[PDB]
Amino acid sequence: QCDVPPNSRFDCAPDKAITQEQCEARGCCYIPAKQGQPWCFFPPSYPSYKLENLSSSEMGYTATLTRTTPTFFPKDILTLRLDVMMETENRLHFTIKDPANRRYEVPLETAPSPLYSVEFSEEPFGVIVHRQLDGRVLLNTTVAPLFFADQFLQLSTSLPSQYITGLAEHLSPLMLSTSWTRITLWNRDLAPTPGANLYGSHPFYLALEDGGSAHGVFLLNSNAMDVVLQPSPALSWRSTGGILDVYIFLGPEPKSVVQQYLDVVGYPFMPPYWGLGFHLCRWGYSSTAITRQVVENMTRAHFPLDVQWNDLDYMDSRRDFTFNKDGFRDFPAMVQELHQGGRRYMMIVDPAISSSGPAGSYRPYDEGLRRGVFITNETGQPLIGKVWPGSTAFPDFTNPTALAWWEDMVAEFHDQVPFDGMWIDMNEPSNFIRGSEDGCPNNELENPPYVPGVVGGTLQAATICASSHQFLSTHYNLHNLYGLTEAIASHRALVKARGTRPFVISRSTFAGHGRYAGHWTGDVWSSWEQLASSVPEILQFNLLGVPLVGADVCGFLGNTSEELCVRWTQLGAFYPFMRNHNSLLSLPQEPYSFSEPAQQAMRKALTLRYALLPHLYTLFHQAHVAGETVARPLFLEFPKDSSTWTVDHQLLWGEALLITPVLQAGKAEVTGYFPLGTWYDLQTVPIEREPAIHSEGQWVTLPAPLDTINVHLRAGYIIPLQGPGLTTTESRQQPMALAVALTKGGEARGELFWDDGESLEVLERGAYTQVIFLARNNTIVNELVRVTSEGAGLQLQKVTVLGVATAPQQVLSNGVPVSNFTYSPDTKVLDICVSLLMGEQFLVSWC
Ligand SMILES: *[C@@H]1O[C@H](CO)[C@@H](O[C@@H]2O[C@H](CO)[C@@H](O[C@@H]3O[C@H](CO)[C@@H](O)[C@H](O)[C@@H]3O)[C@H](O)[C@H]2NC(C)=O)[C@H](O)[C@H]1NC(C)=O
Ligand SMILES: *[C@@H]1O[C@H](CO[C@@H]2O[C@@H](C)[C@@H](O)[C@@H](O)[C@@H]2O)[C@@H](O[C@@H]2O[C@H](CO)[C@@H](O)[C@H](O)[C@H]2NC(C)=O)[C@H](O)[C@H]1NC(C)=O
Ligand SMILES: *[C@@H]1O[C@H](CO)[C@@H](O[C@@H]2O[C@H](CO)[C@@H](O)[C@H](O)[C@H]2NC(C)=O)[C@H](O)[C@H]1NC(C)=O
Ligand SMILES: *[C@@H]1O[C@H](CO[C@@H]2O[C@@H](C)[C@@H](O)[C@@H](O)[C@@H]2O)[C@@H](O)[C@H](O)[C@H]1NC(C)=O
Ligand SMILES: *[C@H]1[C@H](O)[C@@H](O)[C@H](O)[C@@H](CO)[C@@H]1NS(=O)(=O)O
Ligand SMILES: *[C@@H]1O[C@H](CO)[C@@H](O)[C@H](O)[C@H]1NC(C)=O
Ligand SMILES: [Cl-]
Ligand SMILES: [Cl-]
Ligand SMILES: [Cl-]
Ligand SMILES: [Cl-]
Ligand SMILES: [Cl-]
Ligand SMILES: [Cl-]
Ligand SMILES: [Cl-]
Ligand SMILES: [Cl-]
Ligand SMILES: [Cl-]
């Protein structure tokens, strides 16, 4: 009974240090590891639940689960109900609940055969899910006992391979280590560092299968949890409350798994076009005069800038919905002037509301108190913590009245200063003291029987009391949703205040965040290590349906170097959300603050991003309508090439653009993986060294001097480009161009989505233009999917064709010789001047 292979041992003492005698007294096996692997582990006979009265419904199945021997945790729920729902051909859903008591549940909005088959083990109870096509076991919960106690849930499964991604937010490779890794989900204000619970929690994984198929698993549970990965390979979910609410997504393609997951949690929100421009912020722009000089200095040096930001500097004594009458006396005028120049404005908003001001002197607190918007303690008074303004209360964003109060505070402040979005920081929620000014009571929520591996060893560390009261439940159950609930409140407040698409960037997140807001990776150091770590983290958030993500360009903490800032701006120009942000005590890192050569390299990176904005916007449209990723790992695009599975220091934009950054000091080259096919050097496309890599699926060393980032265009793709501007207000008025990357057979395809860039309900109202581009047999045509006033007058003035083997003797536009074209025999590039409209059918041809 104790003969269990080391890698297959499941921990029977996850709760405490245990002796051999105590371990054997639990009915467990004690075998020291020979050098982590648990010494105390479950025999195959350890008591679990027994399946009884399995029954069939039109939805799927129902059963009773009965435990007859208690576990070592208090308050086992001895009788459970199993519900299995065969929802779609690619989505299986099952729940395990207490049929005698409603338990906390996360609030969530709602040949012919399924891709899965399901069977059950009777005793010990397990759910077994096969992929029907090849018989592969994806889920098998029989591998370890089911635990279901009031404050401890444990469900385990075999994994189909050593390759698993997800379970944000942690500083990790994209593929998680299965070598006895404990991953803790408990939203926490901590500067990103490995092995720590960070700002967000996403209880979703995507698991690769030999051959390139994949499945995903979502545990819809917002409690503090540990996820334990072991090398058998296997996974254990360990949650401190709620229920087991499990979704399995059958793929089979990794991109399909992500789309199926986003079908449940929500497709990403469509950002405004201006949100894809460059953002510039620091902590320390201490006046409107200084903030105006940033825009002036960027403009003078020809650096594009769409959005100027301020941190805490604008506030009166670090209070929300105020501005100081010293440095920021003319704040409204500053923001109005930004709008006059075609730029937008963003500023920080914290959740905590100053509670110490004289009564009647600070409306956000006074009105919050009147309407009962705050998280309360045992006696029903507001829980008071300590943040930037001093003593503060914390809004309860599960309370419908708090949502109305937040809408009013945002709308009233927007009447004073017309800001264009909200930067919501510290929404873990972050507390500078432990729990509250009055400490926390001694109860089972504050001191639970199982404490997951959180930094500081307590649920109260850097946050508010776990037993504090919210409208829907205790903070214990709702903590991991706090940031998400603020993002939802802020999204609605901005819609009501401005009547156009909201732009919310949030530190703390939960599963489904991307439906409402974007994210930045928080207080990263200005280091080569953190530049390199940003690529896996940006890819991970794209898999989790938060495509609007980035890191602080040049890093937040510490002082950047000029070389690091060049490399970080080059890579950061490919973050879907691109902001340079800087800490209070740091040396300046605005693009105009560097040497002339560094400025040139940073200007080129920004110029290329701005040229690509129509393409990036189209990629966001595909995320919003079809649950696609914007920035994606090579394995999402080439899953059948197992060499891609561990690549996380390269990224794709969509299907076609491969970015291979330098991520180390002193390098003038980079080695990157090129999947099978032809990859054209984007340097061969004119914008205002081998021309093509012919890959069999291999590593290629590329020249990468300080002024260069490697970007390659996949053969068979067409990308729309637009002319330059210092803002998207300017760039959106410029003529467009196509980059047409031909296959060997002369084929290529691409698309453009265009709307007014900011209106609500565009797709519902049909207020957009959608065009497909097709290259075939020495011709390029457009196919008009939808043409409306928004996009009709888009000018196409240049067509660049890559992979043209022989110089043409004639180039025609709608049957007439073009005014001008150039062919380069060295690079095989045909560059064509044209006078066309995206919204009217054209035919360009050469021979
Ligand atoms: C629930 O939260 C409320 C605040 O909303 C807590 O009120 C605080 O209660 C403490 C006493 O337990 C007060 O401290 C006292 O202040 C007076 C004078 O200011 C001083 O003479 C006493 O020796 C003592 O320090 C504190 O003022 C009060 N805070 C506020 C904002 O009024 C209450 O304790 C919380 N309940 C629990 C069980 O945590
Ligand atoms: C498993 O189910 C049996 C039978 O329950 C009955 O049939 C079901 C379809 C449903 O309609 C129930 O309401 C019925 O009671 C349970 O055994 C019965 O237990 C009751 C109450 O203890 C007893 O009065 C009956 O005589 C039993 N019937 C038989 C045929 O044995 C049984 O308890 C269920 N098991 C578990 C673990 O819940
Ligand atoms: C699901 O996992 C369970 C438990 O690991 C597997 O069942 C064991 O299989 C071993 C090896 O064949 C047997 O000797 C044991 O008797 C089984 N244990 C139990 C509790 O039945 C099971 O094979 C897995 N199922 C599938 C389809 O892979
Ligand atoms: C960041 O740099 C701060 C200022 O450093 C001083 O000024 C610049 C221009 C350099 O010449 C430097 O050598 C000077 O010492 C420091 O006060 C601060 O400690 C630095 N932070 C870190 C984390 O190194
Ligand atoms: C929040 C955020 O992480 C950071 O970018 C911001 O500049 C500061 C100041 O507002 C905040 N840091 S924190 O207060 O320490 O959480
Ligand atoms: C703007 O540049 C001027 C002139 O170089 C410089 O003195 C000033 O400090 C800069 N201001 C900011 C905010 O960068
Ligand atoms: Cl034993
Ligand atoms: Cl014990
Ligand atoms: Cl791995
Ligand atoms: Cl008012
Ligand atoms: Cl309620
Ligand atoms: Cl509850
Ligand atoms: Cl390899
Ligand atoms: Cl290698
Ligand atoms: Cl025309």
Numbering used by the authors: 81 to 115, 123 to 197, 204 to 781, 794 to 952
The authors write:
The interactions of the cyclitol moiety of sulfamidate 6 are essentially identical to those observed in the rhGAA-sulfamidate 4 complex, though the sulfamidate moiety engenders steric constraints on the active-site scaffold. The bulky sulfamidate, liberated from the cyclic restraint of the cyclophellitol framework, pushes outward Met519, Trp481, and the associated loop region. Contrary to the previously observed inactivity of the galactose-configured cyclosulfamidate analogue toward α-GalA,26 cyclosulfamidate 6 in turn proved to be an irreversible inhibitor of GAA with a KI of 378 μM and kinact of 0.35 min–1. In comparison, sulfamidate 6 with an oxygen at the pseudo-anomeric position showed to be a 10-fold less potent lysosomal GAA inhibitor, with comparable activity for the GANAB (IC50 = 112 and 47 μM, respectively). Thermostability assays (TSAs) showed that α-glc-cyclosulfamidate 4 stabilizes rhGAA with a maximum shift in inflection temperature (ΔTimax) of 11.2 °C and a half maximal effective concentration (EC50) of 1.16 μM, whereas α-glc-cyclosulfamidate 6 does not prevent enzyme unfolding at increasing temperature. Kinetic and crystallographic studies of rhGAA demonstrate that the position of the endocyclic nitrogen dictates the reactivity of these cyclic sulfamidates, and whereas cyclosulfamidate 6 reacts covalently, sulfamidate 4 binds in a competitive manner, providing a new chemical space for potential α-glucosidase stabilizers.
Retaining α-glucosidases employ a conserved two-step Koshland double displacement mechanism, in which α-glucosidase substrates are hydrolyzed using two key carboxylic acid residues functioning as the catalytic nucleophile (Asp518 in GAA and Asp412 in CjAgd31B, a bacterial homologue of GAA) and catalytic acid/base (Asp616 in GAA and Asp480 in CjAgd31B). Mutations in the gene encoding for GAA can lead to enzyme deficiency which generates multiple phenotypic forms of the lysosomal storage disorder (LSD) Pompe disease (PD). Herein, we report a 1,6-epi-cyclophellitol cyclosulfamidate as a new class of reversible α-glucosidase inhibitors that displays enzyme inhibitory activity by virtue of its conformational mimicry of the substrate when bound in the Michaelis complex.
